[PDB]
């Protein structure tokens, strides 16, 4: 659209104004002397520009997170961001944004241009080098499937680049031990370890108590949930620099795939009001909340039956964060997967 807010944002604005409680929550979260966005009208206008552009390299997080972080860090923000009616609208905004990100016009950030002193396109050496830091001296065009002599490294869209494939996984990311060893469980995602919890449990409410896993929440009251009581969970975080596809953690059968509406902007209540670092080392509040919002965030639950009956039923949970919250399975229930096979991928979207 050419003039005015994209209709999805306009509907988003009208929903905010249609509920006195929501409307006041969108005033209170902006309290104190502010910079842009200073109110919810500026926030919408700013969404209107972001959703017409692809992200660039340079900030700690994706563009909507950058402008939402200060609002997330308030009681009023956390309150609006944990209403399902408002989160339905976010899903539509980010889903619409993903359309542009799958179009060929999103490739204008697949360049070496340095847009300013803090930002540059994804084909600039600074960005290229960041994405191959854990690949033992091999270059981006060696690790990933692309054409270093083609415009945009041959990618069709920002989403094509975001979901790039390994050129030779058996070189760069081997299935350690071989597909035929059924005693080993592979990592489903390229990531950093974030947490491990033993003897996991369920909680009646998700406040105080350590901001921990609650199985009945994380697994959306699935009937399988009791079998996982007293178990263990390993959680990882996927950076800007990280491959975003999912690989099968075991040889096995896809039992159950469940997509769960959830939050996009909810941080742990014990972090509200913590300082947001301006350096690149210290974690900001939302990034200290991954275990917390794994219970409530927009997510996809995947139950798999390992061919090896000593492993048996396992769960994967793929957890969204802000505008990167679309969880796409590329496998079907009843499908058999071999450890390391494509399982799905993350997208920008709702």
């Amino acid at each position: 659209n050419e003039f005015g807010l994209m209709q999805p944002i306009q509907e988003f604005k009208a929903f905010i104004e249609s509920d006195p409680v929501v409307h006041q929550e969108f005033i209170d979260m902006f309290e104190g002397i502010q910079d842009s966005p200073r109110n919810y009208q500026e926030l919408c206008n700013m969404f209107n520009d972001i959703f017409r552009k692809a992200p660039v390299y340079g900030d700690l997080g994706p563009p909507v997170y950058m402008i939402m972080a200060k609002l997330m860090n308030t009681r009023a923000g956390f309150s609006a961001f944990t209403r399902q009616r408002l989160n339905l609208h976010f899903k539509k905004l980010f889903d619409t944004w993903g359309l542009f990100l799958s179009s060929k016009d999103s490739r204008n950030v697949l360049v070496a241009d340095q847009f300013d002193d803090r930002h540059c396109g994804w084909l600039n050496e600074r960005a290229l080098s960041a994405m191959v830091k854990h690949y033992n001296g091999r270059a981006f065009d060696e690790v990933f499937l692309c054409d270093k002599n083609a415009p945009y490294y041959g990618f069709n869209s920002y989403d094509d680049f975001f979901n790039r494939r390994f050129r030779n996984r058996d070189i760069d990311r081997p299935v350690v031990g071989g597909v035929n060893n059924t005693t080993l469980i592979s990592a489903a995602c390229e990531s950093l370890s974030y947490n491990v919890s033993y003897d996991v449990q369920s909680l009646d409410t998700l406040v105080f108590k350590g901001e921990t896993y609650s199985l009945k929440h994380l697994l959306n009251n699935d009937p399988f949930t009791p079998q996982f009581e007293h178990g263990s969970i390993l959680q990882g975080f996927l950076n800007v620099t990280a491959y975003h596809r999912w690989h099968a953690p075991v040889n096995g059968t896809i039992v159950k795939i469940i997509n769960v509406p959830g939050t996009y902007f909810a941080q742990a209540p014990s972090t509200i009001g913590d300082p947001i670092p301006d350096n690149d080392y210290d974690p900001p509040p939302y990034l200290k909340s991954l275990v917390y919002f794994s219970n409530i965030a927009a997510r996809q639950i995947m139950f798999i039956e390992a061919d090896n009956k000593e492993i048996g039923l396992i769960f994967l949970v793929f957890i969204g964060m802000t505008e990167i919250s679309t969880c796409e399975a590329t496998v079907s229930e009843g499908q058999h997967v071999n450890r390391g096979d494509d399982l799905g991928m993350f997208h920008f979207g709702g």
Partner: protein, 36 residues
């Protein structure tokens, strides 16, 4: 973004110890749990 792997108590596959320290690199497809 984040992903979580969940294992049952009956499951005797055990998480590799080095991943209990936050910030450890997880290379996709590498071993994050094994049966003893």
């Amino acid at each position: 973004x984040s992903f979580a792997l969940g294992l049952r108590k009956d499951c005797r596959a055990e998480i590799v110890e080095k991943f209990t320290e936050p910030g450890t690199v997880i290379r996709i497809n590498e071993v994050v749990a094994a049966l003893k």
